[PDB]
Amino acid sequence: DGTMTQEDISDYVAANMKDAISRTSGVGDVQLFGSQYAMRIWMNPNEL
Amino acid sequence: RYNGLPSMEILGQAAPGKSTGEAMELMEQLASKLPTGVGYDWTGMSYQ
């Protein structure tokens, strides 16, 4: 329904799904095809 | 927290005459009619 972007999905998978799946019976290693949301502080050297 | 997510452990026992299977079935039914984003699970003796 184009409400969530590519990285919006990745954040939900990382935060809500990945941990629960990684502790599931028989699961070895879990590789996220994306990245969990961090607080990005994009610095501007002109203003800085 | 239970399995990484925030939780609250609730204890109880089947009423006189009724079995644990019948009691647990109603807790599931009542838990289904809770607010959006509120799930449940069984642990300890209720897991086994």
Swiss-Prot record, chain A:
Disruption phenotype: Loss of susceptibility to contact-dependent growth inhibition (CDI); inhibiting cells still contact the target. Induction: Positively regulated by MarA, Rob and SoxS transcriptional regulators (at protein level). It is found in: Cell inner membrane. Belongs to the resistance-nodulation-cell division (RND) (TC 2.A.6) family. Homotrimer, with large domains that extend into the periplasm, interacts with AcrA and TolC. AcrA may be required to stably link this protein and TolC. Interacts with AcrZ. Part of the AcrA-AcrB-AcrZ-TolC efflux pump. AcrA-AcrB-AcrZ-TolC is a drug efflux protein complex with broad substrate specificity that uses the proton motive force to export substrates. (Microbial infection) Involved in contact-dependent growth inhibition (CDI), acts downstream of BamA, the receptor for CDI. Its role in CDI is independent of the AcrA-AcrB-TolC efflux pump complex. This is Multidrug efflux pump subunit AcrB. It comes from Escherichia coli (strain K12). The gene is acrB. The chain holds residues 146 to 193 of 1049 of the full protein.
